[PDB]
């Protein structure tokens, strides 16, 4: 049974899980430039509607990572974290994960994010950072220095995943969310072993938790029960607590921590300059549902970070994560870290 | 307002499309405005969602609107098609091609529709070319072929030029999709009757729905062993279509004295298919002949359903008689010879 597109696509459209190595073969065809756009699209859609398994996604992400540019050896702290969403919920939110990232870094946890400029005028993470004066497109050496000197870094996806460009193009062409939406968080080229990961779909969030569990990562995979790939105060959330290769599925109610119920339109995004203004507001200590969501996201990442070296009780872990996140803001540390981050970028010249 | 993200999104959510959306998608594909990735995504998503009769009807309809028709009043009102949708894991071109010749030799006008296969494994057109038949004829010559020989063949790339972008994507992915269903439903001669085989029972029912809305007289057939023809291996399900209604029934050729056969006995290669044609039309008995006679009769029963009031059972007995006779009296062999001779005398 030598792999082929008819064999693999046939299996998927028959609603069957793939044999071992088939997903990996598919990805190696995609990453070497040998997959036609039609084959990429067909595979992406087929994989999605069949329902991908943890093993299948692990093969995809593993092959993708092998093609990626690494950060220099021994430069990424062992306890570095990611804060990121898979997108594909159809809800344009303000850049909560990016704000949370700055807060988490300010609380003493190394953060390395990973992404690209958004195709549409809707400002994504990378676009907002650039609007804030951050240099997002840096080589491996400079990201390493950024992590060392500032405590935070950003891996620009096109630079670190150049062989993924064919796949990325197809993604834009078809528009619909697919299995490939899961690969972003699973192919952070800095390879953090912890993070707060948002996912737009309940079924896929569990698949992701399985992949992270297989890597023995310490992660919280979060799903807004209203369908958001974000952690917010608008409603309750399902959180998969991944640590020690073990996975606990928990419900999470922000009201239990005293947060008020916010409306979803209060978290709506805009253009880059608007989202930049929102970042400055939160880091400036402004109260409201945005800060609340940022503090939740930051605390989540901090709980995941703690999961690397211990396994504390859930609620007291969160209470301390929330405190550290709140402190990081109100001491001015988070605002100060963004400034040091901007400063580091200016020093490069 | 329709868009690919909207339509693809609806399909991936396992939802039927709104009326007109399938048509929009197909029009984009046929006008060269669809990207290969979008074509592929749509094909695969529609397949795994499971298309409805309304959806396939829009796809077939749009495709036909871009097709070259045959000249006015050159297709007999009672012309038939004989074909399967393939995408079965096996192949069936041998039977459909042979049955079509037998049907034409029984006195029923036949107009088939197909293309050359990329693989060495024959498509409908490849076997005919191996027998000396000239497959790539324009509308005028196909019409004269129908008039003078009693049979004709519409070469898809010539009658469906706008379909080329879809065809290319189809080859690249290889896997069967909803597009496999379109062949029988986009015959540019637009025959009103026929014997249509389908590899999957759920899709056979859908095809039957589309034909019903056309007021065609068609037998949509599915071998319960998975064959996209009437099989002798076991029973078949037939969606009997006429006057806008569908009569679904279990069919057993044993009731007509056919011995049970093995699947392997019904093969293949283009050159090997041609040898099978020669053998059968020459009078060789066996499972292959039986399957040909059975499906030929089926097309004749469908043909009768147009303007004859003959009931199912006697129509089949007559159909079987005419099919066997068309072979045993050499009429089928003689018709193939006349078909080849027709093509030779042009250039
Ligand atoms: Mg989001």
Swiss-Prot record, chain A:
Residues annotated as binding Mg(2+) 2: 229-230
GO BP term, pick one: L-tryptophan biosynthetic process
Cofactor detail note: Binds 2 magnesium ions per monomer.
GO CC term (a single one): cytosol
Annotated anthranilate 1 binding sites: 85, 116
Binding annotation for anthranilate 2: 171
One Pfam family in the UniProt entry: Glycos_transf_3
EC assignment: 2.4.2.18
Binding site for Mg(2+) 1: 97, 230
Binding site for 5-phospho-alpha-D-ribose 1-diphosphate: 85, 88-89, 93, 95-98, 113-121, 125
Catalytic activity: N-(5-phospho-beta-D-ribosyl)anthranilate + diphosphate = 5-phospho-alpha-D-ribose 1-diphosphate + anthranilate
Cofactor: Mg(2+)
MF (Gene Ontology): anthranilate phosphoribosyltransferase activity; magnesium ion binding
Family, as annotated: Belongs to the anthranilate phosphoribosyltransferase family.
Subunit and interaction comment: Homodimer.
Protein's job: Catalyzes the transfer of the phosphoribosyl group of 5-phosphorylribose-1-pyrophosphate (PRPP) to anthranilate to yield N-(5'-phosphoribosyl)-anthranilate (PRA).
Protein name: Anthranilate phosphoribosyltransferase
Organism of derivation: Mycobacterium tuberculosis (strain ATCC 25618 / H37Rv)
Species classification: Bacteria, Bacillati, Actinomycetota, Actinomycetes, Mycobacteriales
